[PDB]
Design a protein around this ligand. Structure first.
Ligand SMILES: [Zn+2]
Length: 342
């Protein structure tokens, strides 16, 4: 538990170190952003992870899309086709009544390829593989560019029982959050079609930076909880294990989003700030680790917003993999986390 504090001190090294990198990234983003704003398809475009990879950045480009009509993809409660109900500037991407993910991405990558290949004053390169574009700025400054539509409709029905923050952040807060927009990113489910996936990364960001039962948690010396610290330690636990077990790729399917999702559920389970006292760091981390093991072992990790979307289903992550991680995390917990030693 003082070992855990030692780990957190080791991780805290961003202060002004990243501030130059960010400047590099912010410089290339805004130029890109204002070129897209030229295009008819990209009028409403504007801005909207790995705790130990300070040169890798993640940016989402949001695009306002009214009149929107969702159609669920074959009862996979998180993936949808996009339809409409005048004529939108996005009507150039229709493939039938369905909005084409692939076709909007090609134009998007085409236009970005223009602004990088035509402006090589400060050099840039663009690699490609939902994240449609990755850019290399100079030596290993990478930034991931994601396209998302913004919808201001009510959230889809699949989220009705999600975001179970009532006893933690209040029913009032749930109500306000759900009046905010939701987002859709092009991604296909496991087969290829023009399907989109729900994204709530902005709500996630908001509850994390306003995370207490108390409105003044994080704002005075008397109300310092260890919530963010437990999330960081959980993300580091996974990154270290993925790195150490990399020779055989047992853990390639697991990601920080799985650990962030489990963390939010423990917040729901543990709603009082007194359950996250800093003097109980060791115990709060163990509650996080213990719930993650339960997810692994039961093979159930509900998306925090979409409770019938199981991140740990066998269609996404096979059984052997989840059993292998279970065993390694069990070993770490039962030995006071040797992976954190110096
Ligand atoms: Zn706090």
């Amino acid at each position: 538990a003082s070992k855990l504090r030692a780990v957190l001190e080791k991780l805290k090294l961003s202060r002004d170190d990243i501030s130059t990198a960010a400047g590099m990234v912010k410089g290339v983003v805004d130029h890109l952003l204002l070129r897209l704003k030229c295009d008819s398809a990209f009028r409403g475009v504007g801005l909207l992870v790995k705790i130990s990879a300070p040169n890798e950045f993640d940016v989402m480009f949001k695009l306002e899309v009214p009149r929107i009509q969702l159609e669920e993809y074959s009862n996979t409660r998180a993936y949808y086709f996009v339809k409409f109900k005048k004529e939108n500037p996005l009507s150039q991407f229709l493939e039938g009544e369905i909005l084409s993910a692939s076709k909007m991405l090609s134009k998007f990558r085409k236009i970005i390829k223009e602004e990088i290949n035509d402006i090589k004053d400060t050099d840039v390169i663009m690699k490609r593989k939902s994240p449609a574009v990755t850019l290399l700025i100079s030596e290993k400054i990478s930034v991931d560019i994601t396209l998302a539509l913004e919808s201001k409709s009510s959230w889809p029905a699949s989220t009705q029982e999600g975001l179970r923050i009532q006893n933690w952040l209040s029913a009032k807060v749930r109500k306000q959050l759900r009046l905010k927009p939701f987002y859709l990113v092009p991604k296909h489910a496991k087969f290829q079609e023009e399907t989109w996936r729900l994204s709530f990364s902005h709500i996630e960001k908001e509850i994390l930076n306003n995370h207490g039962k108390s409105k003044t948690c994080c704002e005075n010396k008397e109300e310092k909880c260890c919530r963010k610290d437990c999330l960081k330690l959980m993300k580091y636990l996974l990154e270290q294990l993925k790195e150490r077990f990399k020779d055989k790729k047992h853990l390639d399917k697991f990601s920080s989003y799985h650990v962030k999702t489990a963390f939010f559920h423990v917040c729901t389970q543990n709603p009082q700030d007194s359950q996250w006292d800093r003097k109980d760091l060791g115990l709060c981390f163990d509650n996080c680790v213990t719930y993650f093991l339960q997810c692994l072992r039961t093979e159930k990790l509900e998306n925090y917003f979409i409770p019938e979307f199981n991140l740990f289903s066998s269609n996404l992550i096979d059984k052997r993999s989840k059993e292998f991680l279970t065993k390694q995390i069990e070993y770490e917990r039962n030995n006071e986390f040797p992976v954190f030693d110096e």
